[PDB]
Amino acid sequence: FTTEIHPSCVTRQKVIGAGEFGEVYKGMLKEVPVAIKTLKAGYTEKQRVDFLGEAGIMGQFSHHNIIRLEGVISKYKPMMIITEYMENGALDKFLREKDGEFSVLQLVGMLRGIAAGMKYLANMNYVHRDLAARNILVNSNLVCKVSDFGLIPIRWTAPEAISYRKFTSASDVWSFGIVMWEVMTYGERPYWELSNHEVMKAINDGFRLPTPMDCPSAIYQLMMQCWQQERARRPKFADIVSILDKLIRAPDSLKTLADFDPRVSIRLP
Template sequence: MAKMSWAAGTQCVAKGDHRKPKPEELCYHKGDILTIIHTSTKKGFYRVRHNSSGEEGLINSTNVREREALRVDPGLSFMPWFHGKISGPEAVCKLQPAEDGLFLVRESIRHPGDYVLCVSVSRDVVHYRVIYQDNKLTIDNTQFFYNLIDMIEFYSRNKGSIATTLLKPKQKHGTKSAELELSKSGWLLDITKLKLGGNIGEGEFGAVYEGEYLGQQVAVKTIKCDVTAQAFLQETTVMTKLQHKNLVRLLGVMLHKGLHIVTELMTKGNLVNFLRTRGRSVVNSAQLLHFALDVCEGMEYLESKKLIHRDLAARNVLVSDDSVAKVSDFGLTKVVSKAKSDNAKLPVKWTAPEALKKEKFSTKSDVWSYGVLLWEIFSYGRQPYPKMSLKEVKEMVEGGYRMEAPEDCPPALYSLMRLCWEQEPRRRPAFNKLREKLEREAGKHSGGEGGTSASGS
């Protein structure tokens, strides 16, 4: 029996062909990805948008299945043809039986930092040294590449100055092609359908652009470094499992000169800048409360999935066109049991004492960060612990110091912050309890303050 209550935005995969649609119905083929717009008055039907053509129409819910999340699999690789440090003779052995266009890439033992592309051609194996210079890779000093993914993509389409186009990757034992898995599960998008617009930000790992994919406004995070792309594969895998109105939605990924992660576009930018640039005259406290609730609901959903965010802060919350706040940047998200982290990168002012000291991350350390985020919201985007150095923050917080309430902050909200900042993690409330308290607060407000005034961008 088909699931009869798919929310708008749910992505589905067609189970078969539908080539002769009735009026208002959509034509599609087996494997096509369709996005639900809303339920139809016609029983069992949905109105959908075709992810490739952008066309809209009705479909019968029995003909589609919900698009699957990717399984987290450590063997999944964007570079299954990369074998690391192996010798030339070992590479030759691996490329048997000989087959034209069978290839692998290895690290150069003779020239550390360089790579070698090994290709089988006319029953022989040719070794091409890949030189790494000025942050680019090249075999012939005429064609330059950002990374190995980019290079393999090029030589799979063009012979260039090598003996044959690359036809078949020799996979390293234990790896699976991420490209294939993404494609099978419907998460690989078609780069030719993307119109890339202007740069809207620099992430830690690459630029973020706005763009349009089949008529939908999107944000595209580009990751040029192949090692980082591989690390982001885990983030992407996590994001395929998450569907919630207060989490930034992943639309899919593209592989082209590296990795592109495509998400819904949040036109009003991050919450810190949103609050700083508008301030008290534009955003009233009912709207602040609304943002606090949005984030809380997104976090409650992550908590229910046993995921820790670990970098919750107003800079990682984005605001949509209709002023809904959504949690983004799952770059540090890890499944609860495996939470070990790289301490150098921790955002000290947002990180709970036990996480800073003993690397103990949990939903409760996310709750601590949420308390700091509440302080950011109600101070209209001020930097927490004003005028204090990171070292002072660490020592003072450890010794029991807590920030004062922001100016004009409702007392009930300051007491919520203080609950989030309990020294003992188990004494901090869970996100569902926080949400209940915030809803009660919002109930009191809605009587007095009227609607939001933040929708004016």
């Protein structure tokens, strides 16, 4: 499912990150901008299998809300995975740098796109395992594209996946609930300064993240149901996409806001 790109058509420019056994670059493809993940010499057999395997599944995906593979360099060294370049970068940093700049409808549209990509991934029989705003890319139309840059994300991970390594679409739904909270808070840290062990204890004791400020009641209800302890009680991604699409198409439904519990009280006359 992957197109082979000749190395002379690819120019690496700046390093933008690191991979398992290589760097990640911004570059140009003959010139459309691209992101480039390389596998550097001395890579192991396992690393090659993982690297080309990643390319293989990526080339299979054709969806508006999944990062698009442009091609691969497998016949030459260094080997490369080349994707579209998303100019606004990762969602979490994007929202932290643009705090309060979007409408409720725009934010819920982001979540609908993320949910649509996850519905596709799950129905293609893939589990993400690390769904978080840091793994979602934003383009110049505000379209969110599910991605995976590699890593322990305790705060995003469902209880059963932490406790006995059961990673499924349903534990991805838990993570999606956390991503909903990330988006509606413009990138706040889930559970703030609580330690990983304190987060697990609070969840086991039934506590859950409070409502964001200015959050539609419907949206908080949906993220709450993503965090049900009983995995079978969580919505499927099809349910999430359906609800988000109904709220967006009847946008007055988003004007009713969940109560925000103040953490500070200002007494003035």
